[PDB]
Design a protein that fits this description.
The structure is cut from a larger assembly and holds four copies of chain A. The first copy, chain A, is an alpha/beta fold. Helix content of chain A is 33%, strand content 17%. The longest helix of chain A has 20 residues, at 271-290.
Chain lengths: 388, 99, 49, 50
């Protein structure tokens, strides 16, 4: 039973493609297997997405795994909304109840909001990128009015590569005149490594500042160069290494080959690769649970092209997303539980904070309860006398 | 559907409307298939070949009008449907001019 | 000159027909008057002046 | 000095040798700490410029 699926992978996604292979090797069961049929592309161009999605639908598969960008998200949600082909991805979560879409990434906003009142902030800056959508910026400014903050949000994403150094020095000196001791960053890895290097060069990581790198990899990027400044740095990560199944994975991940698995022989793995491994367990959970209730959906007939006038679905795909959303297994992130829409409920994010020893953990977060500050005194005697 | 069907006809130019959902779709195709497109919708941030915008910009007139009325505190109500490029412009000028 | 056949849009890889460069270039150089006012175009295609 | 963060406005450094611009200096140009030094070979001389 070789179930044929499809892969849409970006160029330069080397660590994730090997992390796709590890799930394909380990979770390969004997009762059925999975046929990858993987193609490489660019994620910003929707034409190649238009090319690749109608390439795999011309062959005809049962599910598709891939990555999308802001410049191509509505290309995906329109096609999988119409052509009734379910889709699984770890990228940034969309806004709106889109059918046939599996968000493998958890939400970050409510956890991000929860941390802010914990420090009891009132005025801060917020440097953001325009690539993961603007849902977080809309989330905080809606909460800014109803809880009376003073936010100076500045975009950074449109800066050219040649004139970086003048613009950041133009950027933070503008922040300095407002006495902005509190900064919240929100980027990918490569911008955060660029921004932090310019913070050091102008010398703004002494005792007195505070930084928050709001993404799922806190120890993912380099952090050692601001360990010893004095500025309190916090951050977010879901993949705790103290778990044994994680520790089993890290023990398995570390010993691997460079030229066979590029980026495997390391100590740590990035969260984008971490969900890529965790997604293959979810895909294999479906067709194992599919054959359990004797549900044959084998549309061996010719799929045809995608440009059908009018386009027609095939109703066995409704059972596929019925099977995919009803998946509760355990992976590197933890408790995988879904909604009817395709989102993720009942997850936990580890709030991590940086000290001189290195990264730590000061608690976790949930939907049901907020930021839980699990770190994991004198009694005064006197007598009542005036004026004492 | 309508794009490839009119591409099958062998048309010279395409006139039409787009929203924030389909804005990436037209710009990906007209740059690829090298056919022109003319539109009265809101213009895209950044540059794109083969797309002729008819609706002019509104940013500098907004930044003039707030400056001409000499404002420092106000409120801003927006709809998501036409993108957020106006919001991103006025929040940048919020920082520089103490708003 | 009309090429005749156009093919399919999802040809892998499709090939552009290189007369559209001359189409948009005259489109970018239109200088007329309409209901809105003066119509002048940048080489990007944004309406200027 | 940079890694522990001790080149802000408030410190002063003197690299007492004949090459002040000899070693790298750009990485502490923008901190705030006033840095002086010694050099004999001025480049403004024409025979030097030759």
């Amino acid at each position: 039973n070789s179930i044929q699926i499809g892969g849409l992978f970006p160029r330069g996604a080397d660590q994730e493609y090997s992390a796709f292979r590890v799930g394909m090797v380990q979770f390969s069961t004997s009762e059925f297997r999975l046929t990858p049929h993987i193609d490489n592309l660019e994620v910003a161009n929707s034409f190649a997405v238009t090319n690749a999605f109608c390439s795999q639908f011309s062959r005809g598969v049962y599910a598709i795994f891939g990555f999308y960008d802001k410049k191509s998200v509505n290309t995906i949600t329109s096609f999988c909304g119409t052509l009734h082909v379910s889709f699984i991805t770890p990228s940034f979560p969309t806004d709106g109840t889109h059918p046939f879409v599996i968000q493998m990434r958890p939400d970050l906003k409510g956890a991000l909001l929860s941390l802010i009142e914990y420090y009891q902030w009132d005025k801060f800056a917020y440097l953001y990128d325009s690539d993961r959508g603007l849902s977080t910026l809309q989330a905080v400014l809606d909460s800014a009015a109803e809880k009376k903050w003073q936010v100076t949000a500045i975009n950074v994403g449109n800066i050219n590569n040649d004139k970086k150094d003048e613009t950041y020095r133009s950027l933070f000196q503008d922040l300095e005149l407002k006495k902005e001791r509190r900064v919240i960053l929100d980027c990918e890895r490569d911008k955060v490594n660029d921004i932090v290097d310019q913070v050091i060069t102008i010398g703004k990581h002494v005792k007195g500042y505070h930084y928050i790198i709001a993404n799922l990899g806190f120890t993912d990027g380099d952090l050692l160069k601001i360990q010893f400044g004095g500025a309190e740095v916090s951050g977010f990560q879901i993949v705790d290494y103290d778990d044994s199944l994680v520790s089993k994975f890290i023990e398995r991940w570390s010993t691997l080959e460079e030229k066979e698995y590029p980026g495997a022989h390391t100590a740590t793995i990035k969260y984008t690769s971490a969900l890529t491994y965790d997604a293959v367990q979810v895909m294999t959970e479906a067709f194992r649970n599919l054959r359990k209730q004797r549900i044959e959906i084998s549309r061996r007939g010719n799929a045809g092209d995608c440009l059908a006038n009018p386009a027609v679905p095939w109703g066995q795909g409704v059972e596929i997303e019925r099977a995919l959303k009803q998946v509760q297994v355990e992976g590197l992130s933890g408790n995988i539980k879904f909604d009817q829409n395709g989102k993720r409920i009942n997850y936990t994010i580890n709030i991590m904070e940086l000290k001189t020893n290195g990264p730590r953990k000061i608690g976790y977060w949930s939907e049901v309860d907020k930021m839980v500050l699990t770190e994991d005194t004198v009694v005064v005697t006197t007598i009542l006398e005036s004026p004492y």
